[PDB]
Design a binder for these strands. Structure first.
Length: 294
RNA sequence: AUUGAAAGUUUUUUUUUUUUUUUUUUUUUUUUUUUUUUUUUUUUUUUU
């Protein structure tokens, strides 16, 4: 199921507390934060919360994290290209005994590109088989505040981010039906401008064996709980600081490093354990190209 | 129930002082109140 967020306002994101300041880190909005906001709205409306809810991280509309096979033609530019139906043209021979070092040959032409896995990329145009793309840059501001009882005693600062329409995939539930606007950010009761959630057409994506684009920061296994095994993993390491309930005591702030978002992993088998989509991770999917947003 | 939270960018400061729209500039120069008109006509210093 697809959702739409007509944000068009200044909101915050992952903060890096420094002394007493706060700084923007992720140019996008992480699934955990969204899920927390959407569940807080449910709690406000009713209070009965459910942990079976999963929502993909939202990204600016018509944008997507970058993967390895979507590099930038310039070593310092922001213009990205890739082949139509690349993953079908890629993969495939993964069934065959084809050397991976030969598989990841990006020298389609002279002056071969350099990729930046996990960056916000905006679709641009057709341009025959090689689709035009552009890196996404957002607007940020600084909001500093004073502390009084008439007379200053301390100081604080914040960094807000400007976003256009936002899109994300969630779980089919009445929660989104009964929730319309969600306070999002570090300061939920101070600093929000405008927020809303729009339901749109249902989305049916298939998760099965084969090369899959890990939208969320996937993790192969945790605490020995094996989720899936991958032939070859292409991406980057990430650090996860989120929330998950294990029913009984405790169940907050579990820190476990993971794969960076947009990493390419060739998984050939899964497991039937407690899926980590509600924990905001493991939102892989099979796509023909980045045009899967359509 | 967002990793997560709660702080007014606030107090405080007069756009104020110095400077006269001032000096010089005669409402005067010229023009005869003259010009035609007889203080005139009528009347016995006088009678019974």
């Amino acid at each position: 199921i697809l959702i739409k967020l007509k944000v068009k306002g200044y909101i915050t994101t992952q903060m890096r507390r420094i002394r007493n300041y706060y700084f923007s880190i992720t140019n996008y909005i992480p699934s955990t934060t969204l899920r927390g906001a959407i569940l807080a709205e449910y709690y406000n409306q009713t209070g009965k919360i459910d942990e079976n809810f999963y929502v993909s991280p939202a990204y600016p509309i018509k944008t997507a994290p970058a993967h390895y096979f979507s590099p930038a033609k310039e070593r310092k530019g922001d213009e990205f290209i890739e082949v139509k139906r690349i993953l079908e043209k890629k993969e495939k021979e993964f069934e065959a005994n084809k050397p991976i070092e030969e598989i990841m040959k990006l020298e389609i032409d002279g002056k071969h590109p350099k990729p930046k896995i996990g960056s916000l990329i905006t679709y641009e145009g057709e341009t025959d088989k090689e689709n035009k793309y552009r890196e996404f840059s957002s607007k940020s501001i600084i909001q500093m505040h004073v502390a009084i009882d008439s007379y200053k005693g301390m100081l604080f600062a914040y960094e807000y981010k400007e976003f256009d329409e936002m899109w994300a995939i969630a779980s089919d539930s009445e929660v989104i039906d009964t929730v319309k606007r969600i306070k999002i950010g570090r300061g939920k009761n101070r600093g929000n401008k405008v927020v809303d959630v729009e339901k749109v057409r249902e989305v049916s994506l298939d998760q099965s064996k084969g090369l899959l684009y890990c939208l969320s920061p996937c993790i192969g296994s945790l605490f020995g709980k094996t989720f899936f095994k991958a032939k070859y993993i292409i991406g980057d390491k990430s650090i996860y600081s989120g929330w998950f309930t294990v029913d009984s005591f405790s169940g907050q702030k579990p820190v476990f490093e993971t794969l960076r978002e947009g990493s390419l992993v060739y998984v050939e088998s899964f497991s039937n354990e407690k899926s980590l989509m509600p924990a905001g991770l493991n939102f892989m999917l099979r796509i023909s190209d980045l045009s899967s947003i359509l």
